[PDB]
Amino acid sequence: LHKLLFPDGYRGLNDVTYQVYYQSEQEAQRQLQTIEDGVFVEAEAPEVVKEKASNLYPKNEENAYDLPPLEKTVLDKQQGFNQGEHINYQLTTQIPANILGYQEFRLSDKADTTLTLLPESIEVKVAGKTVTTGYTLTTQKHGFTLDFSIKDLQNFANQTMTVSYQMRLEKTAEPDTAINNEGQLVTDKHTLTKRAAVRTGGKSFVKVDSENAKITLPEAVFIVKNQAGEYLNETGYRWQKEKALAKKITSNQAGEFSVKGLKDGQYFLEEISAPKGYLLNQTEIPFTVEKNSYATNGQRTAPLHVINKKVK
Template sequence: MKRWVKYLAFLALLVPFFFSGSQAQASEADSVNFILHKIVFPNGEMPDDLLNTGDTNGEHASLLQEYRGLNDVTFEAYDVSAKFYELRAKGQSVTDAQAALSALSADELGTPVATQITSELSGEDGTASFSLPSKVGDKDAVYLFHEAAAPDIIKEKSHDLVVVLPVENSAGENLSTIHLYPKNEEVIHEEPGFEKTVTGKQESYTFGDIIPFAINVEIPKDILDYKKFVINDTADPSLVFQADSLKVSESGQAIPAIYELTTSEHGFSINFTDIKALGKFAGKELTISYDMMLVATDPEANSFANEAVLDTDHETITKEVTVNTGGHHFVKVDLKDTQTTLAGAEFRVVDEKGQFLAKTTEGYTWTTDKNDPALVTLTSSKDGSFAINGLAYGKYALEEIKAPVGYELSTTPVDFTITKDSYTVGATGVLQVVNLKTPEPAEPVVPVTPEKPEAPKPGPVDKVIDKVFPKTGEAKNRMLVIIGAILIAVVAVVWWQNKKGKEE
């Protein structure tokens, strides 16, 4: 019983004034225009029920100024005249008959006599217009307006409106145009989805790489309640915005330019100034894609941030992503004494494909030309240290092209690996690169200068006997001569003795 009392009280406020058949004056017009003004209220701001007067005066007119009309709501008009008069014939009051009709299900209503969808009409959103006969047979017509479909933004559909013709104004005149004000409350506002990503994100990058980014933003269902919807993107000074790469799309299709774009060297701002046009994408996701180049503005840094901010009159959401690069520290030392650091050694960097690292205006590139004048040369300083930064994680090698003074040129590449922490790990991560000292030549023998002989002192002069020293082979020859002489002497003696014996 309480439910019906409440329902009747609501109808008394919501439905315009009407007159029963016995009291009403027949309309002279053949048709009546019904103008429905669909008003939507943010969650929690739905006003109390207001009396419909059938015109554009009073509190409803004020609501239209303060709140907005809702488009894309489908209303159906039903002729319920026969049902109404049947209930009246059974003794029900006009109010009871209206309540009973408004409680009918959609299936019980039958077929609508007209259907309209709210849209902008004469500069006003949420408007639907019906032109319907004022009479059904010889009786005043009775119409029911049913909300058949509405955007997801509304919390629940409005109640059915039952209008019994004719309707009079305050002066007692029949209205040929009747204004109705169905109302809806929006669902609770939800923070829109907002994400920033690196498209196809790699673990790391090299100075000079072009890096693709994307911002995905969900357009709120209640976007038409917004007055401000701005996306700002700001990056590290080492990330340079590529203005020509920016695209704003929905499901892969570019959207119209319903925004103002402002660009800078390291970011951009998109201001959706046409909120009404943006409303066409309510509940959908927009993608903002663009590129940035990683440049070597800070050779000591290897982590770079890119921040996106959604700034509205309802919320502020910030998302940040980072991209990384890597490096390595080295020190040139003596092979046998690693405490001795060596200056002036020069190296080139080679990747796993055998390509050489070369310098560009923005960063690095790789080339197979070992004579390219842009090749990067690393030189050990006074304390033997040198480093490379701004390379993607991976395996590389150093090739020595000039040895320190006094050392042999190394012909063996020095392998090294760049990881997330290889550049910032500290002294324990410094790679020693050694050189062998060039061997010193033997010292030459310096001839001794003979001393000058002293002058002879006065006194007796001794006879100097020159001694003749045999030369090589001379002693052997002399012995043969002596032997020969002896043999001759022996022969001579024997011959002389024989001769003497014969003479005797």
């Protein structure tokens, strides 16, 4: 018996149980494992079998099954991300009950060049359980491919597979721009692409005299704080306790300066060095990073004036 399964309307079929069971009264006939796979009454059959073969190369009809889906998801993405932050990504799919009928099943991701893949971060889970076998992993700088062994995928039949991985936003990440990746799923039966997007923020500033803003002031030096009273250090970025290790931003010849690569939030400048002839205010000077606080489609948002009082 060469058990054979055909999609509703071929391949071998294991896990089928076959049982084998003159009256003078064709019209009597009709009145009466891998060794490779699927080698007379069909008594029990895999869930995939809609219609069993008629009692007698037996011929089995498969249930209808939808193609497996693809979701691509970024965690905690509402406020954007700092340059250097480890952004958490998920590819989710459903290993179909008839996965043995597929020839290929490949998960892959491809990000803009300002998202750097962390290759050690990639972890396949099925039903919450880590899986480290039945795939070959190939990583590039901005992407990876997991090609799955069809045979091994059967133990995850009709269960959810998620691929967690991290990408880091590079310092080349421009604020106020769609920063994309395309997840993909490629089988012999179909292709699914799913895009996701992330963003970082920024704020431009100009240092000016407090009476006349047409007077721009070079050589003013600031550091940045969050609402916790932590200071920004370059390491991309990191918030930490030590003021001494704070990144220092300086007003250029036009008085202009900026912070690029922060998530949405409320921050503060703290002046640590006043332009010559001006007072050092140490009061925290508030500013907000939000969507379009830096630019809109490459058009730079006007700078926030930071005022300096001229000395008596």
